[PDB]
A paper describes a structure:
Here, erythrocytes infected by late blood-stage parasites adhere to placental chondroitin sulphate A (CS) via [name]-type [name] erythrocyte membrane protein 1 (PfEMP1) adhesion proteins. [name]-type PfEMP1 are ~310 kDa large, multi-domain proteins embedded in the erythrocyte membrane. They are composed of a short and conserved intracellular domain, a transmembrane domain and a large, polymorphic ectodomain. Extensive efforts to resolve the molecular basis of [name] binding, established the CS binding site to be contained within the region spanning ID1-DBL2-ID2.
Comparing the [name].4 Fab [name] complex structure with structural data of APO [name] (RMSD: 0.909Å) derived here at a resolution of 3.12Å, did not indicate major conformational change to the [name] core structure. Alignment of the models shows no major conformational changes on [name] upon [name].4 Fab binding. In comparison with the APO [name] structure, we observe stabilization of ID1 (N521 –K522) loops upon [name].4 Fab interaction.
Author numbering: 1 to 415, 496 to 541, 554 to 694, 699 to 714, 716 to 735, 749 to 1059, 1092 to 1990
The structure:
Amino acid sequence: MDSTSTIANKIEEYLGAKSDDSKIDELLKADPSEVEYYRSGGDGDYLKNNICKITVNHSDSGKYDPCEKKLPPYDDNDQWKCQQNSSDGSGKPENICVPPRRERLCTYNLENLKFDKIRDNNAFLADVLLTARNEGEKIVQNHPDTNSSNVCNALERSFADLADIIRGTDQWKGTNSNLEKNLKQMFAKIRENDKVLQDKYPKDQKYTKLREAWWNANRQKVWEVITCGARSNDLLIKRGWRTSGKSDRKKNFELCRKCGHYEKEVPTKLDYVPQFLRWLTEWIEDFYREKQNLIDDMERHREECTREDHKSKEGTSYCSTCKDKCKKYCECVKKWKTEWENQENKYKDLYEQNKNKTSQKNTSRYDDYVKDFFEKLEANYSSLENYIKGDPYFAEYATKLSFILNPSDANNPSGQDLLGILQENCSDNKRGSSSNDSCDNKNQDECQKKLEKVFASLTNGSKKKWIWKKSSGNEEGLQEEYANTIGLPPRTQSLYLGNLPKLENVCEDVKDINFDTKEKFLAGCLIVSFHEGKNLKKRYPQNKNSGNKENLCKALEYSFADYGDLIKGTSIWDNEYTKDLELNLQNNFGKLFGKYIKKNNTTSYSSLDELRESWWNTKKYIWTAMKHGAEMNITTCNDIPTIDLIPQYLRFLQEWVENFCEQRQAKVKDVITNCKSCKESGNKCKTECKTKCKDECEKYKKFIEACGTAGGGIGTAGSPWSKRWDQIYKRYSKHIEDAKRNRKAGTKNCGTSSTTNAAASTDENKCVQSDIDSFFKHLIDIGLTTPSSYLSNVLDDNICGADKAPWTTYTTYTTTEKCNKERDKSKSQSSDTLVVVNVPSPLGNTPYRYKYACQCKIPTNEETCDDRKEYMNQWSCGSARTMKRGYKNDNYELCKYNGVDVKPTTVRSNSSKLDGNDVTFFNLFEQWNKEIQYQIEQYMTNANISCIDNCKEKCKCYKLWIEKINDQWGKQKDNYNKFRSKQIYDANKGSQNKKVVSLSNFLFFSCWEEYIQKYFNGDWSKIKNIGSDTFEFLIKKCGNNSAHGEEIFSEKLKNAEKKCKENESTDTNINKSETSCDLNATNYIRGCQSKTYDGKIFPGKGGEKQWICKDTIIHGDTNGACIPPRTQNLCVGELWDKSYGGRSNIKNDTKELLKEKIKNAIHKETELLYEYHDTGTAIISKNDKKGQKGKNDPNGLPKGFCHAVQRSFIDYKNMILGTSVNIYEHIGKLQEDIKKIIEKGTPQQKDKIGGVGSSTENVNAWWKGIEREMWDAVRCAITKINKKNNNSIFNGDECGVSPPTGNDEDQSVSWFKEWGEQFCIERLRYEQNIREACTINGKNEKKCINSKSGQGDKIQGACKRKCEKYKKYISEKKQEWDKQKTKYENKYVGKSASDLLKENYPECISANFDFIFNDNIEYKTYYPYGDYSSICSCEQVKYYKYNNAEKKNNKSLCYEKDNDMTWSKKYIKKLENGRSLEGVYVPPRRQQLCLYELFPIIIKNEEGMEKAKEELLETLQIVAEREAYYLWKQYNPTGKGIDDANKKACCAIRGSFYDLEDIIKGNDLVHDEYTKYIDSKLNEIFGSSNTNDIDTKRARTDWWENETITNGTDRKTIRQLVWDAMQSGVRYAVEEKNENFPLCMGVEHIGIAKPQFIRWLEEWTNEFCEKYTKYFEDMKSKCDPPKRADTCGDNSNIECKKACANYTNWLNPKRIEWNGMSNYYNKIYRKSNKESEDGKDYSMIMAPTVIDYLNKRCHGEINGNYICCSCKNIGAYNTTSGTVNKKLQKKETECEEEKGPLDLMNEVLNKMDKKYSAHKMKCTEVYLEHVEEQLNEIDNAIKDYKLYPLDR
């Protein structure tokens, strides 16, 4: 044993392992993890995520694969002249017989491997990976053999060839020789530069000895790369003996006889032998195997005798015809056999030179490694291990040699084809099943025959725990891809066939091979099926069933499907018998049915797997045998179950969930029976338990939370239900992701944003491909994206338990970790280790609704609100969300926020200033002020809308937190009272700071600062305090001057009303007396006989009035809105008159006279409006262009009198009161005559009291309550007018009992609304005219509006007459509208003109005011006719490529992207099925996204479908190009950083691309003025609206994704076209800047789009991190004390003020935004389409908390692709992992891990982290000084705004 050598077979693994001698191989192994492989489109992260999916995109695309030899395919085959010749030197026609041994490798097209920049191991191994992947694909996919036990040997041969190429030992080398010397020299020169990292001290550099170490170091990587493409049925290592072998060794892992693909270690140790000798197997073994196959396979028996009938052809005639007509002309083809059997023996005939050591006629290259065979094989003993004798397979072809004699006998005797198609419908659910399913195949060739119903025959001859364990490494388990994922059922591991190592052991009576024919094989399979049925009959009945068969039928179905998967080879689980039964099955199915395997290159069978799948699809006989086997039979309960087509993982999931549900029902029945209070769970709180019902709840909790042994039921393995469910969810989401990223599937209808696919393969209409990926793809688009939804769909109903606990919902609780093992000792590891929050679907520790019904007592009204989560909890210790800690004393009541611990440490403080706890109180209080103001504003408007639809949740979850927030405001004001009391010392010292300024004053500052921050771009712009005329609203919102901020909360809490109430209500009273109005003879009114302001009534036209805009001489400056023509022609009655200048007819009378005058005036004007709208003479009344007869409103009576009478009432009201802009007849005299002449001395008496003083402020406040006396008259008139025209049969009503609405207080807004409605109606009429003009002059001859060139197809009068009037109308209306929108926005603030107009009138939905009245000269140039330019300007919009006379500058353009916009929650979609309140925020980049080009085409293509798609595609491409160009212009030149700017710009462009894709697919979360109409019209176009909404969305998604456009350049989908357009825009920007094209954005493949909310969240996180870093660095550079003192330093205490103010102002709204984002995430994560709040799925989100998800995403460094966010030292301190290691004290490190200090996200927003705690005091005091100064400024500003009473 002392003569051990180093040959590395089985014993040199631990003794001879000298590879890892020094720390060099660890860095020598190649890890291709560098981002952006060249500029062709490679990426490191894609390769790291999966090594098996490497493509040619890692270098120049489409032009790399070995052996660039240009042999053209379809003219010749096997024609080469390369090697040598002697007589025909011109070429090499035929001088050597090259075998097809290596010529069949992936060696055909485009080995253009010459490019440079390959410098390191990352770039070095890329070509090796490409070669390995390509050779594996070529050797596996199209393999002419019958898929026998030779694919492993073929892959081994390919790997040996690759190893020889790398080592250079290969002898037959072609064009790769130039690289081989290049690798030996260039890659030597580029790898020897790092002399520090390598120990090449011996001369010279040890090139070979270092490259061999490099290859040994990366031995594994190339192994899994080359084996990536192989199928799981490889079954490597030829030794197939059952659980043993001729070379018995120790137990290491499950190498028997599989698990090499996932082994992560080399299985083939035969490559470590000296490779010089290793190369003999290439010559001999391949010929041996091929000849052994040739001699035996084509034996076609003697069935071609042509006895029954004469046959012209026999299929194979080898001896019957040819050898009878002649002797050997057709059979004597074996001549290559003294190199095989007559050319064989040129291998081992070198024994002539005996005893042969030193070779003198060879080369000297250190041949000591090959000197072994000098004596080892010639004249030495051959007594060694079994690797030479016994282990190799040398006699397996019926060998009967008698080379040895053994007289002793002490051993006992041993003891062309059809291919049908089917569309059987799977029903994997019990609900309505709104969709269907399908399958394929069926053979009708591989079967029994006929004459079914064969029965009888008999007498042919305890793992009961779920193996949820790692992969089968020793005896049992699952597959490597399925390890610890789903768990193996006991029935599945105890099924009969899985226990049989070979199929030939089916029958005990016969003990030899019996499967030689198809029927013979099927007979054994049927025997196995019958045995399984009998075994299940023995097992299940009759203990778990009450005489029925549902359990028995379920077990038979599951076992039937498991047999199907096992015989198909798609089994996901393994035992000791499996992987040998599979090998025997494959050997049988290769020996039998081998002829049908012909379709290797294109009915026949493509491969062996499809053949086996087809055989199994011939399953009715097997199912009938299984069914008849046990007791099911016939005449007791009588089709084929569809359970088998469902994937085995899903079947295992359903079985495990059914087991868990049965156990849960057993454990919850007692809980339901007992936990009732007296007879129901909710009743009496006292003695809720009858005696001790808590024991049942304790049992349930123990069952749920056990570790599999402390009370838990059968199932799992030492792990909780929660852990097992999490593993299941992870595996299921991985399957969903793989299906979505798959390329091949059947016919489906994609309708999800997170989907991409090019081709869908199927042969039948509306059929899925029946594969696992296709089945998961079909699972997608009907929901079912999560296990919760899938199980909710497939489960029966009440099997989950007596309590209805649907799997869709999620219930959260808190629990202690398993008590068997304590993490890192006990009593000091952490607090959360004992308390961890869990959130599964109804796996909670309580039976769903009995969270509070259990453990006695009933849920209080306070905690029911928390359960409903309608009003979330934010603060803890005395709050807007319940609970309080006190105490009523001096110090100190603080409103602590949830989840963050308040730190009262006063060590941060200094002397003579505020205390640390007071500063923390101030910060907490200002945050509380902001958040509570926001929440009151949000929740004050909801009211839940009733009815429809205690009285809802306004008694609970409302009117409770109102009182409790009143209490919280009282607490906060009491605490601030103590805070302000600190002026006993500092008030005189710092007069006048008040130490500090009072609470009401601070609230005033807070609201003013809130206004300034939004409307003046930051609080730092408070110097620009000129608010123009927005003060009135602002002083209304903030109170007149200071010392009234307390009143702000007083009002904001006293207005918590207007609902509940309710009460009953008081409705309904009666109308107001009295009708009368029968005196139609109202005399004549000199004012107006007819309001002919919109022309005259037919007959006769003319006299149209015009909108009196501002700057009119009669109204002075007129800063208000325009005067309506109806108001201009208003029927004043007998009050005002003309012909005498200003005449007041009613001058000496009282108001008693004018009620009759106003009454008959409104009567006549209303009766005219009833006639002014029947004839359509009013602009508001007239709709479309036919008139009011052909086109009429639906509401029973002409549209435009209810609004007209409302406007008349409003303008009469302001006529009495005094309008903002007096109209025409100087209304005021009425406003100073019955308090002067007709407003004169009424009702206040003229008798003065006191005297001159206190006499001029008691008279001017009376006329506000006298205006109500006219609405009754209006009601009487409007009811009376409709009731004379009884000529047609109808009653007098506008649209039924519907009355005119109220809220008639607003007047200028009413005028604006009237103007907007009239403008929209006129625009619709003009649009109809333009469409008519575009349809006319265009006939069947395809004429185009009579256009000639000219300068293209321009209009010259056909539709120009119709469109120029529209153009001038838009011009004048823009003139009127830019002067009204500004006034309305300044008056109301926060309400845009469009968001006011659109909802009040349906006709405004088609108008985008921003685009129509865009203020841009480029807009005027490119859109001469406004939004209808595309209809009129018919130039056939056409997106031009990057080159060949591009037209971008001459094309339509927009403005540059804004850089400092704020996140806004406006324009969020209003989801149907209300109370779906989204808390999301639109990114600035998305809300500034330019899509203005779409809108004209969107308007144009309303009619004329099948033409919209081309125009839409073109405009989308040009928009994407311009968007990429402007985003690059916004990002890249702002700092010329080569990497940061480029990567940030590319990430932003990818985000914009994904947002555009979501807009197209309809998954966008924003409905602004643009995208709302874009989505509406896209829905109208796609599907033509004749389908449903889901169908429309699916059509849109399919159109975006599939290859829809037919182009002459390959088959590029619309998504690819848009990405290419964005790339072209980036190229334009780069060329303009004269830079280099970015390394990223060169990717042709764009990844799967994450959900829009998640992308927005990641963008928000990245922006927040960058802004936080910038602002904190500014603060640390400025607010930190100077190095040369402060008083005498370079600072003036001003730049620190600026930095602190900027930081606080930026951080204040970010907390609210993050709170909203987290609130939405906590309700959206881990949800599918059917359960998420929105329709889109979120199954890819696997993270309990948003912070954890961000840590999983933001931990790394941004690269430009996929990774779009990063965090550096945010929050905590400038140090990342790692500082302290837990290994040195107690294993292991359990964080785990922090992954960047992003967990401080919640704490930093409360200004509580250490980084801000360093500068909190100075920032706070500076903020307070700023507060005082700006109150001074604002008060002075208001006093100056008073202005008027000073001088003239």
